[PDB]
């Protein structure tokens, strides 16, 4: 039960999880 | 943030989901 995602994945995985953006 | 989180470390999805901005 777990994910773990570096680089673009990561940040592509925030895009499609994140309805209204992400921006550390 | 996301990345000690869910790249550093396994995250579940809803970890995930919490990082995003709302």
Same mark, same amino acid.
């Given at each position: 039960? =777990? /994910?773990? $995602?570096?680089? &673009? $994945? /990561?940040? %592509?995985?925030?895009?499609? $999880?994140? &309805?209204?953006?992400?921006? !550390? | 943030?996301?990345? %000690? =989180?869910?790249?550093?470390? !396994?995250? !579940?999805? =809803?970890?995930?989901? $919490?990082?995003? %901005? =709302?």
């Amino acid at each position: 039960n =777990s /994910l773990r $995602a570096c680089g &673009p $994945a /990561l940040m %592509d995985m925030l895009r499609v $999880a994140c &309805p209204n953006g992400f921006n !550390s | 943030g996301v990345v %000690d =989180s869910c790249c550093r470390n !396994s995250c !579940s999805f =809803s970890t995930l989901r $919490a990082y995003c %901005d =709302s």
